[PDB]
């Protein structure tokens, strides 16, 4: 139950929602020794929020995005995106004058690379099913 409320607030894009769960339900995490994730998960909550806002908005203002994610200042609005581009989180191109942030949707490469990489696992796994079936079939 406490753990389930944890993941419930983790998948959300609200940062304060996540910081409340550690305060109330940290006492249970002490026994599991699971605090090792709780420091590094914040990175994933901010990356989730920015992912949502990236696909869900064509053009977003960096100053106005901080109020929803409780980012609190203009300066870190550039930082999250900077590392977002550095890690390949968002392909959007950002202009700093005011500044503003615009995003674009590119596709069509898409099903070229992704399905063949999956197929490499799919087919190899299917022939492994064939080998494991032949092995137990030849015993009689």
């Amino acid at each position: 139950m406490p753990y389930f409320l944890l993941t419930q607030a983790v998948r959300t894009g609200n940062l304060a929602k996540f910081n409340q769960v550690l305060d109330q339900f940290g006492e249970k995490f002490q026994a599991d020794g699971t605090y090792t994730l709780i420091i590094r998960l914040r990175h994933n909550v901010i990356k989730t929020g920015v992912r949502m806002i990236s696909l869900s908005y064509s053009r977003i203002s960096l100053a106005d995005i901080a109020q929803k994610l409780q980012l609190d200042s203009p300066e870190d609005a550039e930082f999250i995106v900077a590392k977002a581009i550095r890690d390949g989180v968002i392909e959007a191109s950002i202009n700093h004058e005011k500044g503003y942030v615009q995003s674009k949707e590119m596709i069509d490469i898409y099903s070229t690379r992704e399905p063949q990489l999956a197929f490499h696992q799919r087919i190899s796994f299917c022939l492994d099913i064939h080998n494991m079936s032949v092995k137990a079939m030849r015993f009689p």
């Binding site: 419930q8 607030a9 959300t12 929602k17």
Partner: protein, 40 residues
């Protein structure tokens, strides 16, 4: 088994993910949807 480690210590779920999204967000909602009308 019970050997070794373990003695030491459609369906509705796919949509229940979205329902979990409804649980922590915008209630259901009737009242607020009816309260937003007279605010402006």
């Amino acid at each position: 088994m019970s050997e070794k480690k373990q003695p030491v210590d459609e369906d509705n779920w796919d949509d229940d993910n979205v329902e979990d999204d409804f649980s922590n967000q915008l209630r259901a909602e009737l009242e607020k949807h009816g309260y937003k009308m007279e605010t402006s």
